[PDB]
Design a protein around this ligand. Structure first.
Ligand SMILES: *[C@@H]1O[C@H](CO)[C@@H](O[C@@H]2O[C@H](CO)[C@@H](O[C@@H]3O[C@H](CO)[C@@H](O)[C@H](O[C@H]4O[C@H](CO)[C@@H](O)[C@H](O)[C@@H]4O)[C@@H]3O)[C@H](O)[C@H]2NC(C)=O)[C@H](O)[C@H]1NC(C)=O
Ligand SMILES: *[C@@H]1O[C@H](CO)[C@@H](O[C@@H]2O[C@H](CO)[C@@H](O)[C@H](O)[C@H]2NC(C)=O)[C@H](O)[C@H]1NC(C)=O
Ligand SMILES: *[C@@H]1O[C@H](CO)[C@@H](O[C@@H]2O[C@H](CO)[C@@H](O)[C@H](O)[C@H]2NC(C)=O)[C@H](O)[C@H]1NC(C)=O
Ligand SMILES: *[C@@H]1O[C@H](CO)[C@@H](O)[C@H](O)[C@H]1NC(C)=O
Ligand SMILES: *[C@@H]1O[C@H](CO)[C@@H](O)[C@H](O)[C@H]1NC(C)=O
Lengths: 272, 49, 124
């Protein structure tokens, strides 16, 4: 199926070609449409006299999504002004990646051939990160993350806090939050002007950077004789407003006051 | 309202510079510096914490 | 040249100063010596361990007179008792007024820095 197929690098099968005579009866097997003709075969009955054939054909229904298996469709043929006047049996199967394989059979008589629309060559799947499967829904590829990433409660939420010298930042892998039930999150500090942002280091993360100062984002500095802590509060919600399940992240990291230096350059004395 | 408490611990950054000159303008990029006992040394500790 | 140069104001550079360890491995370009240290640099091999340096240098030969153009000299380095034991390349050019410029290049090894004699601030 996905691995046992032939390709057709033909630019003439596109729905823009003027007119022709060639008809398909020698087409036998599973095919991968590639080239400037198109990668998918037509979804609506193209007007007559196109696709290098007097009576072009199309697939009625929709292209299957990812992870469906074998799907049977009845390819229609448009002729004489009546869309879907002749019918043929086709078997469409999606594949891992941006291509499809078709069980292409010979129509009952000549002057019948298949087309290819420009389809979604602009739409790509590399925009999905490595942890995002190349899934699809109704023929449109989307980035569904690991299904294993499934956390119900909010106590187990992962918090990537490193306390850098100049500032502290709290990171959240967006997979766990999208599994938590927030299609879009809103990280609000003590001042909402400190909204979070996306960053990718090893996976997808959205993070809030709070400067390690007293007051810059309403940051509360509390220094005792030993250490100095910066205490603030973060706020999460899936929408602008909150009606239930209030989220408050009270993170605080403290820096030392007694601390050491040694020179990195050896020094050598000489005396008479 | 549910309150989660987490934290961290961070270190400030503090260095030295072997200032070739008095008045402490240019640091030292070497690894072995050889002087005589009579010469003065011009150093300090800096803070990017 | 006489308009494209970097001012150097350092009172410690003088041959009178006791000793240090400066090595000007980063001084890039043309420089105009100013300050109590001096506008012209040392014309003779100053005794070792001076000018805030274990081994200071000196320009061998004389400063060019006015209207001399680009003058190529080789800065000598007095060290271990052998004056001009190490050598550098300098390009001293006369400038309009009582000041000069130099093409100061990095010494091959550290503990090599330049001096400035009191020169002729008196000569007006
Ligand atoms: C002055 O303020 C400073 C900074 O706030 C404070 O230092 C803090 O000391 C307390 C008391 O021991 C520490 O409390 C923590 O509490 C929980 C458990 O109760 C844990 O998080 C900590 O233990 C961890 O220690 C290590 C940290 O990685 C690990 O072995 C492991 O995770 C342990 O669970 C700890 O007990 C608090 O952490 C420090 N703050 C730091 C280290 O930043 C100091 O005590 C104050 N002095 C006063 C009030 O006189
Ligand atoms: C597409 O799939 C079908 C079903 O897997 C392949 O086999 C056809 O199966 C039907 C139903 O059992 C039979 O009646 C047909 O005779 C089979 N077709 C052929 C050509 O033998 C079919 O071969 C596949 N088509 C292509 C073009 O690869
Ligand atoms: C001093 O003058 C020289 C000569 O114009 C400047 O350029 C150097 O020229 C020599 C001879 O061609 C080259 O080998 C060097 O590589 C050149 N140096 C550079 C940095 O390009 C020289 O730069 C001048 N020096 C200073 C310190 O101003
Ligand atoms: C093909 O699909 C179209 C669009 O829904 C529908 O009108 C038509 O009836 C279908 N063909 C058959 C044979 O059911
Ligand atoms: C530099 O000039 C001095 C003084 O005239 C002289 O002794 C020395 O040989 C010169 N150096 C070179 C490399 O010619």
């Amino acid at each position: 199926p996905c691995q046992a197929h032939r390709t057709l690098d033909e630019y003439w099968r596109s729905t823009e070609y003027g007119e022709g005579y060639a008809c398909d009866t020698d087409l036998r097997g599973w095919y991968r449409f590639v080239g400037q003709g198109g990668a998918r075969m037509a979804e609506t009955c193209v007007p007559v006299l196109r696709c290098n054939t007097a009576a072009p054909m199309w697939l009625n229904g929709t292209h299957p999504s990812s992870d469906e298996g074998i799907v049977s469709r009845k390819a229609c043929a448009h002729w004489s002004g009546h869309c879907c006047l002749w019918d043929a049996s086709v078997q469409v199967k999606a594949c891992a990646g941006g291509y499809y394989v078709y069980n292409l059979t010979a129509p009952p008589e000549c002057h019948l051939a298949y087309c290819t629309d420009p389809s979604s060559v602009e739409g790509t799947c590399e925009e999905c990160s490595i942890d995002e499967d190349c899934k699809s829904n109704n023929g449109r590829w989307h980035c569904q993350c690991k299904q294993d990433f499934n956390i119900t409660d909010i106590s187990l939420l992962e918090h990537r806090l490193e306390c850098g010298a100049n500032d502290m930042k709290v990171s959240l892998g967006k997979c766990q939050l999208k599994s938590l039930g927030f299609d879009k999150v809103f990280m609000y500090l003590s001042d909402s002007r400190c909204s979070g942002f996306n960053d990718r280091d090893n996976r997808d993360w959205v993070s809030v950077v709070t400067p390690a100062r007293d007051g810059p984002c309403g940051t509360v500095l509390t220094r005792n004789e030993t250490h100095a802590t910066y205490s603030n509060t973060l706020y999460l919600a899936d929408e602008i407003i909150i009606r239930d399940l209030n989220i408050k992240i009270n993170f605080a990291c403290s820096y030392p006051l007694d601390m050491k230096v040694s020179l990195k350059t050896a020094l050598q004395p000489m005396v008479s | 309202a549910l309150n989660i408490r987490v934290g961290g611990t961070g270190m400030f950054t503090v260095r030295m510079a072997l200032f070739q000159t008095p008045s402490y303008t240019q640091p030292y990029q070497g690894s072995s510096v050889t002087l005589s006992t009579e010469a003065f040394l011009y150093v300090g500790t800096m803070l990017d914490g």
